[PDB]
Symmetry: C3
């Protein structure tokens, strides 16, 4: 599971660490993914690089999760909710603004350690 | 709808401002999306971080749209055309080099305000 | 096709150069795509912006390939093989850590030169 986070700049180093750590925790508790398979990446949006509803310079925090298809609806809703709550508890940005997206991948398309697809592993 | 733009370094602040503003317009007018729901993000690619058909240091401008399933072909073709046109008008990079990608998300996978998906939102 | 590389900071200029050039070669050789169609983009992850299995400050190299639907499983496996191998040969990051993802696009979803889709071109 890949968690790619887009945040507007302004967070301290402490907040970044906490955001990524608790996001990883959120994935583990939501869909029961092993920690060894969880990765979080942070992309920071500089000033004027985020247009929100026609407004510049607004706080932003968006989650995108790349994962192998097959998760149940309950798992998806739990994942969206956990990451959204994590983001707000960490950054202070309300869930009304925080967004989370889920992207499905066929096992044949998800390469794994040693450079083979998840289907080849029969993951 | 999320519009994520990847552009090579070199643009002025004014053209950056122009790029995102008109990108927002392109979305509103192509698929009839409410302005309140339209977001545009910009990522700048430094020199040597963009390889174009074997060549480094060439101008780059690529659009990626993340949005919910259900749009007609006409809407989708219009969105691609409008973003391509917008990109050329604001940066000077010809539509021959400009690129637009679309991502369909099922309502079950697209989170909304309040940490709930579009499907659960009903 | 689009090859978007996410890599932790630390690579020299010449290694970044080889990585992009050989990732392009990997695409051309694996799926037989013309050189004129291959694009490679590099996103560099600063310190503390990549969490790997609960640990910060680890080397990271992740490939995401955005491309049109229709490629065979044979090509997909070969592409994942070529990029993973390229990633290690260039950066020195072992294939056990290197990751390659493949993302299918409907022909109507892939904009081409001139602001029309691949489907509109007749592909």
């Amino acid at each position: 599971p890949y968690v790619t986070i887009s945040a507007t700049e302004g967070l301290s180093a402490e907040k970044k660490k906490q955001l990524l750590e608790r996001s990883s925790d959120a994935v583990v508790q939501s869909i029961g993914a092993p920690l060894a398979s969880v990765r979080v990446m942070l992309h920071e949006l500089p000033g004027g690089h985020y247009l929100n509803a026609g407004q510049f310079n607004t706080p932003g925090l968006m989650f995108v999760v790349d994962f192998i298809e097959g998760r149940t609806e309950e798992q998806r809703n739990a994942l969206i909710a956990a990451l959204s709550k994590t983001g707000t508890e960490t950054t202070g940005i309300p869930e009304s603004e925080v967004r989370v997206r889920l992207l499905d991948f066929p096992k044949a398309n998800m390469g794994m350690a040693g450079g083979i697809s998840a289907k080849a592993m029969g993951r």
